[PDB]
UniProtKB/Swiss-Prot annotation, chain B:
Pfam families from the UniProt entry: Acetate_kinase (PF00871)
Catalysed reaction equations from the record: acetate + ATP = acetyl phosphate + ADP
GO molecular function terms attached to this record: acetate kinase activity; ATP binding; magnesium ion binding
Function text: Catalyzes the formation of acetyl phosphate from acetate and ATP. Can also catalyze the reverse reaction.
Compartmental location: Cytoplasm
Binding site for substrate: 74
Protein name: Acetate kinase
One GO location term (cellular component): cytoplasm
NCBIfam families in alphabetical order: ackA
Needed co-factor(s): Mg(2+); Mn(2+)
Oligomer status and interactors: Homodimer.
Keyword list, A-Z: ATP-binding, Cytoplasm, Kinase, Magnesium, Metal-binding, Nucleotide-binding, Transferase
Origin species: Mycobacterium avium (strain 104)
Alphabetized PROSITE patterns for the sequence: ACETATE_KINASE_1 (PS01075)
Length: 379, 381
């Protein structure tokens, strides 16, 4: 029996999961936090802690049938898109992308360097969150700005949550018992970050995030779509700097910017007690999502299935209902008995007579990455 | 017969028209160009308007016997302050000056047009009409961006929308073409010209629109980018060393169709495509994909939709653009008819098949007439 250790290395925290790719069982899962007065000063002590934690649940990596270490990287730019076996020269090369993702890419490189020292007798593979969308058609990838300037600095729509969108699309096909290559579909990843995609066969046609993960849907702490003139306008009126504006749009916007709350489950309570700011944030969220659904129906022309996924998507009945209500003339009919809170697994939530099928499909990024590692190392 | 003089006062040029609001008949039309140039006999805005009186005299208008009753002035941005057609006086003009950070390039020359005209025609009433007015009322879920609330409130940041005069007027003509009251109709309007925008409308109330805080947001345009990740500004500061103000200017003046292909006129674009140019085909396909998305989005906002209308310079004339925008949409209720879509006819006309669940029209826009009828109405009779 064989296993893959999957790592997600951010700036103040580190996530890990040890998983068997054939059965899908997770032997051990955990997170190291707060990497100021902390027992974990740097990234070296952090990986050492994860080891102690694995030992504590009865795991030993010499006995566990370890065959690979998989590392998550947010941005592969225009040059890294397939799963990639790591060496010295590939790693040096990866440093050139920090321009595109300065908060997220450098701590992943830290995680790679440490893992390679402490575990030199095992192959290490990088997997890129941008990779599924590398082949977007040019009509959808190209922004309408100065050509020469765009090509020089590699500006285009990159897209994110690629591992999740590809996994759900495959599982939706299996649930329906139909070949994936003959399907057209829409996927909605609703978590702390939010994005939508439109997919034909095995190839994506469009997606809601852009150059960076800021664009598109309304999120927990990010604005999504906004006129790029806000930057200039805030400079000339408020005397705000460019770095200040960008930071406000990433960490002090979305639901928290409108209502003061990040935690989506608190928002329902505050609405029932008559808080006006909370009701406005929920309806701004809902309005943006309805637009992306209609826009992708037109892009596709004919749509077989629509699927909800991630933390909010798999669990929030009110959200799914408010996303597609009043759309029967477009082909969507929801069934209230089936859309009930508290259900489990892949399931149908639309009426039997709905022209377009609607599903909940749970996501499993770590399991998809483990299967990617084994494939690249020769089956 | 009574008549109104309608004025559009830009930085380098001034447009005008003398029109009868009851008959729709335009007695004189024209433009004064190259204002401020060393070569030019027109050094400032005072001389330009005087030039315009002479052309009217040339065209046969005896100004003292023409039955003139108002001057209509168009202004791009009214903020949250001015949204109805407004009788001008010196107090109103002072309040307008304070709004110029919302429109640094377009608002100032329109104020100059007002001040010159009040001095030369002091015994006629003057009226301002705001391109933002129709959208002042958007529902809060469509008007509000998802950013820091205290911040948005202090600096008056919201979706304002533009092409207001055109969207309203076309929505009224569509209802009239069909023999139906406006209050019972849900409709989409597509204004495709040098600038481009879309709206979603329920009776007399707009539900959404594609331009935003400024005219930069939404569809792909002649020289403007439309939608793009706001992170471009940040990214270009750090890597190409560009200043905020130069990015803004690039996004407004060197993007769009021109940025991708080198070309302006859409009639030139077609010839380049049919001759096989690769960059031209790409520019046009990016333009088309963005437009298809806005049509789908607003079908979902409305829920049920009665009619879709094309208008302005491209919408009224270009039959390939219409076909590319709505083909392949039969499962959404749209069926186009090839024979009615052909170039040649002018005037309001149907282009969908007789049995299409959703009706599709071409409806010509007449912004000068709409503005003249507003002047007469606010002046009490």
């Amino acid at each position: 029996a064989r296993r893959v250790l999957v790592i997600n290395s951010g700036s103040s925290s580190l996530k890990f999961q040890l998983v068997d790719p054939e059965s899908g069982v997770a032997a051990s899962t955990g997170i190291v936090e707060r990497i100021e007065s902390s027992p974990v000063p740097d990234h070296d002590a952090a990986l050492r802690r994860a080891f102690d934690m694995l030992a504590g649940d009865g795991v030993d990596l010499n006995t566990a049938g370890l065959v690979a270490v998989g590392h998550r990287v947010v941005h592969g730019g225009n040059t890294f898109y397939r799963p990639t076996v790591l060496d010295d020269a590939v790693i040096a090369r990866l440093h050139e992308l920090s321009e595109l993702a300065p908060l997220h890419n450098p701590p992943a490189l830290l995680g790679i360097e440490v893992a390679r020292r402490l575990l030199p007798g095992i192959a290490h593979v990088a997997v890129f969150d941008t990779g599924f969308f590398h082949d977007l058609p040019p009509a959808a990838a190209t922004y309408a700005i100065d050509r020469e300037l765009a090509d020089r600095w590699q500006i285009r729509r990159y897209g994110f949550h690629g591992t999740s969108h590809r996994y759900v699309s495959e599982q939706a096909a299996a649930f329906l018992d139909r070949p994936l290559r003959g399907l057209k579909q829409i996927v909605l990843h609703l978590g702390n970050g939010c994005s939508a995609s439109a997919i034909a066969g095995t190839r994506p046609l469009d997606t809601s995030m852009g150059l960076t993960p800021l664009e598109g849907l309304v999120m927990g702490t990010r604005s999504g779509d906004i006129d790029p003139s806000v930057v200039s306008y805030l400079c000339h009126t408020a005397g705000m700097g460019v770095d200040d504006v960008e930071s406000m749009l990433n960490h002090r916007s979305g639901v928290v910017g409108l209502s003061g709350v990040r935690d989506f489950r608190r928002l329902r309570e505050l609405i029932e007690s008559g808080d006006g700011a909370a009701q406005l944030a929920y309806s701004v969220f809902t309005h943006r999502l309805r637009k992306y659904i209609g826009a992708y129906l037109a892009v596709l022309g004919h749509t077989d299935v629509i699927s909800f996924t991630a933390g909010i998507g798999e669990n929030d009945a009110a959200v799914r209902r408010d996303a597609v209500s009043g759309m029967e003339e477009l082909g969507i009919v929801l069934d209230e008995r089936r859309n009930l809170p508290g259900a489990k697994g892949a399931r149908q939530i639309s009426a039997d007579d709905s022209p377009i099928t609607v599903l909940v499909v749970p996501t499993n990024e770590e399991l998809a990455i483990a299967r990617d590692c084994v494939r690249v190392l020769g089956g």
